[PDB]
Nucleic acid binder design. Structure first.
Lengths: 80, 38, 63, 213, 91, 19, 150, 125, 241
RNA sequence: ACGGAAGGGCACCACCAGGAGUGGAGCCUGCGGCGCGCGCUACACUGACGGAGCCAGCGAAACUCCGUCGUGCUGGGAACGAGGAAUUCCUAGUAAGCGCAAGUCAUCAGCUUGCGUUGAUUACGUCCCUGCCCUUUGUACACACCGCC
């Protein structure tokens, strides 16, 4: 305050409580980003692998070609 | 007589052989001193 | 031959063209409706009328 | 009826200004001889690429007309003509020489065929500039041509280049010089005689385009 | 300088940002005794706007643009003595 | 003096520059 | 105090480029709305038309007489209005670089006589300029205000 | 004691100082009148400042212009710049401001290189 | 803003004198690895074709470089227009009958200008048609720079390259000191199972520093940090004179 | 570790539209061992002349005007008539034309660097060709879009 009043053109002036300065009255955590409320992550058991696509693929339902494909894909995913 | 400075170093096959085995030993060490992302 | 005048309205980017030939979507002036894509050689802006001798043949890529 | 008077004394400065100059102060004529009024471009599709809506006094308006893409289509047509005419190995930067020979050129196309010289040069440009053209399509190595069209900027550029290089080829080393040969080539291209180098090259280019269209 | 701000920033430095002494070090005046007279008469702008109080601290990024206004007697007599008074832009 | 010319500071003024 | 025009991508919050070009501090910016050209304006008496998209980064300077504040752009993207420090407004075409006209506005603003003055109430160039400009959305009216109360 | 005004103009290296004062019409370049400008083909390039606005705005003034430096065509561009901006400065501070910005609108409608010059050098691509 | 450039360069002279008292250096520490530097390459005045293709070889040698044309560019407004472009380095080439002789490096935002004589050049445009250059942001190698002047020249000479190349980044550029003659070659390689095989391409030369001034290129009032001494009676007895 | 495919950017060692050189002849510093090629010079009505005018900048030529030839190894200058295959370079006060200074510890007097003078044409877009580079977890925090290389 004392510095910019010395070094500015125009002047610069300066129990149970409440608050007059808020983001919004109406929204109030009913306006949240859905990515922050949930994102599809990794799996929860060792029988399957789910992707960030939104699908779920199990090691007991995959053939061997798609299993080699997914292993190579997550090898590149780990590599970069 | 006497002369002021050493003349221009003429490029001979011996000096380019020493420069090439210098640089190939250096990159066999991979000790190249570039910058860094900082 | 009856030459016709026609006004460009959109220069199609991203097409695979010969360097120095730009495709364009021109439309006529005797009626303001029927459009035709041609391929012009020089520098071309929007809405500057160019001349056409052939009236019906559509254009294509230039490999 | 209607009358407006603004000056009241006969204005004569203490230095005597020539009478042709104080006549030109009413309306700007080119070289104090040729009105840019009553010049119209009889063809369409080359208006706003030739530019005969600004009465200048001499074709040396040295503003910056090339540091954008399309802003060399607004400096006037005879300034583009003299600037395209100025260039060869014997002359670069000889623009007062180029201006004086364009002055002799339009003066003698007046004394031969008085329409007005800027009208002659403008419809000469419109008749000169070609309308279809060929390009080398790739094809891996085959020398196959292909037919394209030309934007009006390319038509005006190739028109002034064909007129200038035709006058160059027509007075390289023979009897006349560049001034009167530009005059004769430009009046042939203005009339449409198919005897000038310009319309010869336009007919050749459109003929090969028509052939391998 | 990080921890030795204990000893150097004193009156002789915090007053060295003042518009009179910055004016005198810019050689816009003979001394402070008439530099205060100029900037109290209101001839001296900094940035785009005129500044009249002779206690102003010109900052670092405004020392480059503390110059006389157009249409003033001192700017006119400076350009007259240099004989370059381009009188299109007011002086 | 060449260095002072390259830093001339074109807004200097004194009482002695009236004539 | 670094004389530049920074641009960031709003998709990924990184610094795209330190788009330099001026000689002094910039004061007022605007993007267009039809071609999205940039029209910067800086205290080297210069406005600067920038085209930053599509392989080019085309620069074109336009040079005004006095110092420059307060740029605004017409909503049809064909011309740009700029204030000056010498109490004027200019308008410039931007596909060209010629002017259209300059409204002289240094006789019709009444700044106030300060209580800290020796001078008069009218001759002192206190706020005889326009610190901010805006066009109207029809395209004709321009509103303008400065550090004075007019 | 006459009302004088002094302006400067410059293309590439030529410089033109113009003294406009209340006179009777005469217009001088290095003493020689404006009818005799050296390169003889850009005489209308030096005329058109006093030809866009009419000679009746030059009936009351007289202009003496010293010109040094620069080549031929840079000198004649400097003279046309000095003539134009000297006329608009004289009309700025000795006759009406409406006539001043009418002249300024006419010059900036013909071409604004008659008044101020693009004096900022090149682009490093 | 001439008072601004004068004030900043006077602050630069103070910073350099203070650093030389209390001895990446002072001029480069703000931008050691953050900003990728841009390089403007020019020739002397009305260049020859051989000099111009050498300047093309230099622009192809180190990246983020443009080869700006030089005809009737006055030197002070050239360097201040380069400053208002806001790039980092300027490199000027002076020739003699097609053989280039001077390479002036100027880190022009109030920085140092080194000058190099440039003795035995070889231009790939007049020997070898083998294709394009590799143009990857390269690696750098330096041989026996141990003097304080050697550290200064390697700082201002490697701070014009692209910062932080990758492992796969192929071409290496060498700067070898053989008795105050920085020999420059540049190579590409692969890793064989036996070892490594290099491929010489691009220019080769050797440059001797002969001035290193603290001011910018245009001034000639710049205080000399170092220049060689040709005519002392112990000239040929040591290195980095 | 090795490939491939897809997407995306860049460049006069790319496409495009042109401009100017090199290569033809003489003198040449050098690089090779006579060749290479860097500058300099001649060959063209843009001509040759003959008068007359006139402007710079670091530290006066080009030019303009007024008169005389003359399409001819010509008056240009014995030779010599604008230079093949190819190749190189170049995007605005730029290519180019023109002179004027200096000789700044390395290089340079055959020249080198500065300084001004006059000053254009053509692209200013495209990744189709030549290639070069990057990416193939969106994490970057909204809205939207993509959604297994």
């Amino acid at each position: 305050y004392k510095l910019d009043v010395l070094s500015s053109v125009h002047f610069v002036p300066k129990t149970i409580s409440m608050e007059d300065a808020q983001p919004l009255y109406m929204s109030n955590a009913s306006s949240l980003a859905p990515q922050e409320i949930y994102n599809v992550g990794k799996a929860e058991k060792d029988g399957e692998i789910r992707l960030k696509n939104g699908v779920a693929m199990s090691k007991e339902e995959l053939t061997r070609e798609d299993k080699n494909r997914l292993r190579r894909a997550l090898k590149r995913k780990r590599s970069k | 007589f006497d002369r002021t400075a050493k003349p221009v170093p003429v490029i001979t096959s011996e000096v380019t052989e020493s420069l090439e085995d210098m640089i190939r030993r250096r990159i066999q060490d991979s000790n190249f001193d570039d910058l860094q992302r900082r | 031959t009856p030459v016709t005048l026609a006004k460009v309205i959109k220069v199609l980017g991203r097409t695979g063209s010969r360097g120095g030939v730009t495709q364009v979507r021109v439309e006529f002036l005797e009626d303001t409706s029927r459009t035709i894509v041609r391929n012009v050689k020089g520098p071309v802006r929007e809405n500057d009328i160019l001349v056409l001798m052939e009236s019906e043949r559509e254009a294509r890529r230039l490999r | 009826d209607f009358e407006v008077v603004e000056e009241f004394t006969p204005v004569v400065l203490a230095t005597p200004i020539p009478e042709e100059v104080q006549q030109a102060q009413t309306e700007i004529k080119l070289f104090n001889k040729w009105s840019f009024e009553e010049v119209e471009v009889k063809d369409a599709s080359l208006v706003d690429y030739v530019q005969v809506r600004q009465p200048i006094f001499v074709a040396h308006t040295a503003g910056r007309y090339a540091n954008k893409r399309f802003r060399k289509a607004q400096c006037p047509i005879i300034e583009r003509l003299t600037n395209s005419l100025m260039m060869n190995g014997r002359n670069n930067g000889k623009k007062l020489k180029a201006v004086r020979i364009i002055k002799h050129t339009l003066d003698i196309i007046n004394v031969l065929t008085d329409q007005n010289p800027i009208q002659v040069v403008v419809d000469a440009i419109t008749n000169t500039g070609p309308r279809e053209d060929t390009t080398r399509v790739g094809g891996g190595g085959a020398a196959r041509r292909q037919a394209v069209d030309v934007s009006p900027l390319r038509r005006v550029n190739q028109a002034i280049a064909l007129l200038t290089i035709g006058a160059r080829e027509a007075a390289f080393r023979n009897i006349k010089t560049i001034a009167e040969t530009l005059a004769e080539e430009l009046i042939n291209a203005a009339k449409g005689s198919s005897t000038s180098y310009a319309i010869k090259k336009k007919d050749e280019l459109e003929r090969v385009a028509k052939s391998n269209r | 300088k990080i921890s030795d701000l204990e000893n150097k920033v004193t009156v002789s430095a915090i007053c060295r940002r003042r518009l009179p002494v910055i004016m005198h070090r810019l050689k816009m005046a003979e001394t402070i005794q008439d530099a205060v007279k100029f900037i109290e008469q209101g001839h001296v702008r900094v940035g785009p706007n005129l500044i009249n109080d002779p206690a102003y601290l010109v900052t670092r990024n405004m020392e480059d643009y503390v110059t006389w206004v157009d249409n003033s007697k001192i700017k006119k007599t400076l350009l007259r003595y240099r004989n370059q008074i381009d009188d299109f832009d007011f002086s | 003096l060449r260095e002072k010319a390259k830093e001339r500071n074109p807004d200097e003024y004194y009482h002695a520059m009236h004539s | 105090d670094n004389f530049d025009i920074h641009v960031w991508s709003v998709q990924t919050g990184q610094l795209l480029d330190a788009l330099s070009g001026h000689e002094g501090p910039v004061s007022c910016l605007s993007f267009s709305q039809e071609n999205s050209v940039l029209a910067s304006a800086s205290w080297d008496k210069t406005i600067r038309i920038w085209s930053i998209f599509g392989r080019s980064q085309q620069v074109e300077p336009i040079e005004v007489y006095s110092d420059v504040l307060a740029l605004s752009m017409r909503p049809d993207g064909k011309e740009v209005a700029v204030s000056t420090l010498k109490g004027q407004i200019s308008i410039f075409n931007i596909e060209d670089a010629k002017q259209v006209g300059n409204i002289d506005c240094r006789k019709d603003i009444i700044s106030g006589r300060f209580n800290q003055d020796r001078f008069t109430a009218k001759n002192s160039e206190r706020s005889k300029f326009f610190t901010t400009i805006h066009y109207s959305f029809d395209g004709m009216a321009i509103v303008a205000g400065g550090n004075n109360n007019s | 004691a006459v009302p004088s005004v002094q302006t400067f103009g410059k293309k590439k290296s030529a410089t033109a100082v113009a003294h406009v004062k209340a006179g009777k019409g005469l217009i001088k370049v290095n003493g020689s009148p404006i009818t005799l400008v050296e390169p003889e083909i850009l005489r209308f390039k030096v005329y058109e400042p006093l030809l866009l606005v009419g000679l009746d705005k030059f009936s009351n003034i007289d202009i003496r212009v010293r010109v040094t430096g620069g080549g031929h065509v840079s000198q004649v561009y400097a003279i046309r710049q000095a003539i134009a901006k000297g006329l608009v400065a004289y009309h700025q501070k000795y006759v009406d401001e409406q006539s001043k910005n009418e002249l300024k609108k006419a010059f900036t409608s013909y071409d604004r290189t008659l008044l101020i010059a693009d004096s900022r050098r090149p682009e490093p691509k | 803003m001439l008072r601004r450039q004068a004030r900043e360069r006077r602050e630069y002279l103070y910073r350099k004198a203070q650093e030389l008292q209390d001895s990446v250096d002072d001029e480069y520490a703000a931008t050691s690895g953050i900003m990728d530097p841009r390089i403007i390459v020019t020739t002397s005045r009305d260049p020859s074709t051989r000099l111009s293709q050498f300047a093309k070889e230099i622009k192809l040698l180190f990246p983020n470089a443009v080869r700006l044309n030089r005809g009737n560019y006055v030197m002070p407004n050239l360097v201040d227009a380069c400053k208002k472009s806001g790039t980092t380095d300027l490199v000027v080439l002076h020739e003699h009958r097609g053989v280039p002789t001077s390479l002036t490096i100027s880190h022009f935002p109030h920085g140092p200008t080194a000058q190099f004589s440039l003795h035995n050049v070889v231009m790939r445009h007049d020997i070898i048609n083998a294709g394009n250059q590799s143009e990857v942001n390269p690696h750098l190698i330096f041989d026996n720079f141990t003097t304080a002047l050697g550290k200064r020249v390697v700082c201002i000479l490697k701070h014009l390259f692209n910062a932080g190349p990758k492992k796969d980044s192929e071409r290496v550029i060498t700067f070898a000191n053989r008795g105050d003659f920085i020999s420059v070659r540049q190579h590409v390689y692969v890793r064989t199972r036996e070892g490594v095989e290099i491929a010489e391409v691009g220019p080769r030369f050797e440059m001797r520093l002969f001035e290193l001034r603290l001011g910018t290129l245009e001034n000639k009032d710049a205080d000399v940090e170092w220049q060689l001494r040709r005519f002392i009676r112990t000239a040929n007895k040591k290195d980095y004179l």
